[PDB]
Amino acid sequence: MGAVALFSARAVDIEVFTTRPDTLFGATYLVLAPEHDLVDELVAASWPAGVNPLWTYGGGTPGEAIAAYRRAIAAKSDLERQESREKTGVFLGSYAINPANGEPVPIFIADYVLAGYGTGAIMAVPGHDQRDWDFARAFGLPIVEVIAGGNISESAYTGDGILVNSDYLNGMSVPAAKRAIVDRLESAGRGRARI
Ligand SMILES: NC[C@H]1O[B@@-]2(O[C@@H]3[C@H](O2)[C@@H](COP(=O)(O)O)O[C@H]3n2cnc3c(N)ncnc32)c2c(OCCO)ccc(Cl)c21
Could you please report the per-residue DSSP string of the chain?
--EEEEEEE---EEEEEES-GGGGGG--EEEE-TT-TTHHHH--SSPPTT--GGGTTT-SSHHHHHHHHHHHHTT--HHHHH--S----EEEEEEEE-TTT--EEEEEE-TTS-TTSTTSEEEE-TTT-HHHHHHHHHHT------EETS-TTTS---S--EE-S-GGGTT-BHHHHHHHHHHHHHHHTSEEE--
Distance from residue 151's CA to the centre of ligand 1 (Å): 21
Ligand 1: residue of 111, 129, 169 to mutate (most ligand atoms within 8 A of CB) is 129
State this model's resolution in angstroms. 1.1
* Cβ 188 under 6 angstroms from ligand 1: no
Total tally of structural domains belonging to the chain:
1
Task: Determine the structural domain holding residue 52 and report its residue range.
Answer: 1-195
